[PDB]
Nucleic acid binder design. Sequence first.
RNA 1: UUAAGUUAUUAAGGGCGCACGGUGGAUGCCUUGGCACUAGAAGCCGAUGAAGGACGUUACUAACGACGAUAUGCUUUGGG
Length: 65
Amino acid sequence: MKAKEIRDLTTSEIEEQIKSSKEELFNLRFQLATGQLEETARIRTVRKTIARLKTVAREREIEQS
RNA sequence: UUAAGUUAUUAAGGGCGCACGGUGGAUGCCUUGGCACUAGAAGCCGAUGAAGGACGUUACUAACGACGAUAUGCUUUGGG
Ligand SMILES: [Mg+2]
């Protein structure tokens, strides 16, 4: 998910998205450990999505001040 | 046939010459790195936590670079 869609989202929605993305990343890591993950690029995709969500949240709590 | 006399061949190995190999890394050519300077800029960083490090971050990750739990990177503005 890109920064434009994230900026469309609301702050509570960003927090919920961060939670769900973290759960997805964790499940991917567990599948990788057990040898059940073929689509390894998903891990990096989700990690960068989490980074973008946090970046936008930080931008908002900065512009608030 | 006998007698007297003379002189070779031998190369176990060695010497000189030559041919062909091996080792070794001189020499020539080369340069990715140095050395000495010129001109212009700049001449500090740190409790808003420095210099320098440790430990981590990748799909697989021992090491160097980069990066810091937003980790082998995030946003934005321009270039292409
Ligand atoms: Mg651009």
